[PDB]
Every structure is written in C-alpha cells, then in structure tokens.
C-alpha cells in the first residue's frame, strides 16, 4: 500500500506534518534522506543561541500515555555542524492518518536546528554512537522499516517529488510511485554504500564541457545545495566564474555574480545511461543583499541536495538497494501505484 505525504517547501528544507504520542501531537519536521533518526523538539527544550526551535511543533512526552523511555542518550551532529541531543524513547507515530506503534524516536532537549528531523535513510546510518567511537544503544527499526513491518507499505521504498523551485509543496510517497511526474523511464541505479544513499555520478557537463567524476553522490533531501570535493568543485568554479570566499575561520563558500547568465543547463550523468538536467537558475542563490551564493560548494563529501533533486523524480528502494531516477515532469496529474 502507499502513503502520500505533503512536503512544505520551507526554502532551505522540505518538511512534513507528523504526529507523535497517544494524543497525536503534530510536529512539522524536515524530511531527510541523509539521516536515519526521527527526533522531535521537546516542549521544554532549550534552543541554541539565535535559533527559533519551538515554532514548528513540540512534543510533551508526559502527556502521551504510550511514551516509553529507553534509558539511553541521544546525540547527533549534522554535516553543517548543527547538533541535537536528548534521550531515546518509543511512541506512536502517525503519518497522514496511518499510525505505527512503538516507533523509536529521540526526545530532544537541546538543539541548534530550527525544527525536528525525520531521518528516513538506512538503519546503518543511525546516530547511535558517542565521541569515544562506542555504540551506546543498538541500531533499530527506523520509520520506513516500521511502516513495512507493521503492514503499512509492502517494501521499504519511497518516491521523492520536491517539485519546482517556485512550488509551495511537493510530495513524498512511502511505498508508492507517481508515474505521471517524470519523462522517460525510471532507471534503477545501484546504491554504492551500505550506509549512505549514494549512487555513482560519472560526470558533470557544465557550460557545455564535460568534467569526469566517477564517485558516489549522496542524494540528500536534507541538503539545500550541491557539494563536491574541493579539487573538483574548483575545476567547476573556474568554468562557471564562481569565487571562493573565506566566510569564517574554517569555512569557505563559493559566491557568484547575481547577474550571471543562467540560461544554460548543468547535466549530471549516472549509470545505465541515465541523465538529469538542472536549469542554471539553481546555481545562483540570492542572499537578499546584492550578493549570491553559487549552488555548488566544497566539501570532502559529495552531496546532490535540493537544487539537484528538484529536477529528478526518485524512487528510493532501501530493500533492493537501488535508487531509480528520471527527469522530473512538473504536473498535478497523478498516476499512483504501490511498490
């Protein structure tokens, strides 16, 4: 069976409404293929300095009759350095009316993130370790696994439709696919890590020139922009006219002139002949002050974030270890089938 869930385009992130507890407390949480844990902002949390973290729903464990404490510490650090911490528990999770019982989640009492995060990646990427390198609580069934085990979906799989850059909403379908929302055929690509939702990216064609890559790229709904290894990003920046700026002690970001020509397209070539094309508007990110970030940035990690993913329809299949991709077709027409 399938569960369609609306994605709110928040700007940097895409979020959905998900209820927790016996009393179905609504949380608005980021849908994140790049992490694997579902955590919620406790109503008694302390937000980090400068962070409005209690405006997107909060969770009061003491008002849920079904909340169970697991007696284990939770800590996570994300790629941008933000963190959350709390403790592990289990409770009922409800997604567009469909409830799963005894779902392990983290009750977060301190965070520098604006809202909770629903991590839907592989169980092997759960944040269950401490800074010593020891595992402090075991790996567990995260939301997609539990949806399968409780009979709500047939297969641990979900389709991602972020929709166009201007769209207010997109859709994630757990256990289904909307065959109206792409052109060509969905091409299954093998996932290249047992822990991360990466597929092999063969090359990037930018301003008409090919740049060979040949390494995995994380298809991360929870990243705003696109990240490449420093050397490769610098080659692309030399072609694009982007400028590397030291913005803090150990952070560097590419900027680009806000009036840059964005008439062209950037092409991403994957396995089995698959290609995704991205309009170049996606690489000029307005800062609102007459400066613009480039949509590609340096990192040790390769990540194709939302500025890529808006242009693909993706069927992530965590049971098969494939991600099937096709050029998106923006349409309200819908032809949904279970997977």
């Amino acid at each position: 069976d399938s569960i369609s869930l609306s994605l709110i385009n928040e700007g940097p992130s895409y979020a959905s409404k998900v209820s927790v507890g016996s009393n179905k407390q609504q949380q608005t949480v980021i849908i994140d293929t790049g992490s694997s844990d579902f955590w919620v902002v406790d109503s008694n949390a302390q937000c980090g300095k400068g962070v409005d973290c209690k405006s997107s729903g909060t969770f009061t464990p003491s008002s849920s009759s079904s909340y169970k404490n697991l007696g284990a510490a939770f800590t996570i650090r994300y790629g941008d350095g933000s963190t959350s911490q709390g403790t592990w528990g289990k409770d009922t999770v409800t997604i567009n009316g469909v409830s799963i019982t005894g779902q392990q989640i983290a009750d977060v009492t301190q965070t520098s993130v604006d809202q909770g995060i629903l991590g839907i990646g592989y169980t092997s990427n759960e944040a269950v370790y401490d800074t010593s390198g020891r595992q402090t609580t075991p790996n567990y069934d995260n939301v997609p696994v539990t949806l399968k085990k409780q009979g709500k979906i047939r297969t641990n799989a979900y389709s991602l439709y972020l929709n166009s850059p201007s769209a207010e909403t997109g859709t994630i379908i757990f256990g289904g696919v909307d065959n109206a929302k792409y052109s060509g055929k969905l091409v299954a690509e093998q996932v290249t890590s047992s822990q991360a939702l990466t597929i092999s990216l063969a090359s990037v064609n930018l301003k008409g020139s090919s740049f060979s890559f040949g390494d995995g790229a994380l298809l991360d709904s929870g990243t705003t922009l696109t990240y490449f290894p420093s050397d490769f990003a610098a080659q692309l920046a030399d072609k694009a006219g982007a400028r590397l700026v030291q913005v803090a002690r150990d952070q560097y970001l590419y900027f680009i002139d806000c009036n840059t020509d964005t008439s062209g397209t950037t092409v991403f070539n994957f396995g089995n002949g698959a290609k995704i094309t991205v309009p170049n508007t996606e690489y000029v990110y307005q800062n609102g002050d007459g400066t613009c970030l480039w949509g590609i940035q340096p990192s040790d990690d390769t990540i194709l974030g939302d500025n890529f993913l808006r242009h693909a329809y993706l069927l992530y299949n965590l049971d098969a270890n494939t991600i099937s991709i096709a050029q998106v077709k923006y349409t309200t027409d819908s032809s949904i089938s279970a997977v």
């Binding site: 996570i76 994300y78 933000s82 991590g119 990427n125 991360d220 709904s221």
Partner: peptide
Amino acid sequence: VVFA
C-alpha cells in the same frame, strides 16, 4: 543546511 546539510543534514549525517
């Protein structure tokens, strides 16, 4: 942002 960059989500782990």
